[PDB]
Amino acid sequence: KGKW
Amino acid sequence: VDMYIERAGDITWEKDAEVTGNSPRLDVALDESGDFSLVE
Amino acid sequence: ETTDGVYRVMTRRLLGSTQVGVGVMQEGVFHTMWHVTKGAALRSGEGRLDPYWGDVKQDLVSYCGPWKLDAAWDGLSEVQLLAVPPGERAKNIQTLPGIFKTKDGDIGAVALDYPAGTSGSPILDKCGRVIGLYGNGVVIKNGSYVSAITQGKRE
Numbered sequence: 001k002g003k004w
Numbered sequence: 005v006d007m008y009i010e011r012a013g014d015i016t017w018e019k020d021a022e023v024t025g026n027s028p029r030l031d032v033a034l035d036e037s038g039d040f041s042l043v044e
Numbered sequence: 045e046t047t048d049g050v051y052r053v054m055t056r057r058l059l060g061s062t063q064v065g066v067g068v069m070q071e072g073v074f075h076t077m078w079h080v081t082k083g084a085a086l087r088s089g090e091g092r093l094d095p096y097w098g099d100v101k102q103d104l105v106s107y108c109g110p111w112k113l114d115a116a117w118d119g120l121s122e123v124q125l126l127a128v129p130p131g132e133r134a135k136n137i138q139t140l141p142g143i144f145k146t147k148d149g150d151i152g153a154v155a156l157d158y159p160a161g162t163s164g165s166p167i168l169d170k171c172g173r174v175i176g177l178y179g180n181g182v183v184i185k186n187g188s189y190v191s192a193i194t195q196g197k198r199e
Binding site (some may be wrong): 005008010013015016017022023024026030037038041 | 049050052054055066078085086093099102103128133134136141142154168172174180192
Binding site (some may be wrong): 001 | 083095096097098099100
């Protein structure tokens with residue numbers, strides 16, 4: 001994720 | 005891999021602390037991966 | 045298992061442990077630098093802490109909830125690194141930050157050099173609030189180190  | 009945490013103390017400012025290090029003025033770039041690099 | 049304070053982040057396989065970083069427990073949330081954990085889950089005693097928020101560009105990650113550390117360097121005053129180096133007890137080092145000048149603005153930066161596993165140690169204002177975490181920075185010409193004062197956003 002770079003949870004979004 | 006077991007990655008775990010263990011307490012290491014309280015977070016408190018220390019009065020009359022040792023002061024060290026300079027205050028550099030640096031030109032940097034930040035890439036999309038979070039890498040800071042000096043601008044040459 | 046989430047009592048407020050500063051913590052070492054350790055790894056262990058079959059043999060001994062290695063300290064890979066440090067982080068801050070505040071308001072039930074654990075805060076560290078992304079490069080310490082690579083955004084993976086953590087054990088705390090018998091409990092599991094799951095990643096919640098993070099951002100590789102900021103090099104930050106929080107566990108159990110959103111990022112809670114809201115204090116900002118005032119752009120003027122001396123700060124303290126509460127360094128937690130591998131194998132050594134926490135110590136406070138006071139310094140006047142320098143500045144990383146970037147195209148998107150200035151970031152405070154501290155010219156303090158510690159082992160890699162000190163990553164995630166908190167940087168404090170005079171009220172003891174955490175104004176950022178130590179350990180993402182640059183190596184200057186002579187080989188010494190300068191860390192950004194890396195702070196997240198409390199939404």
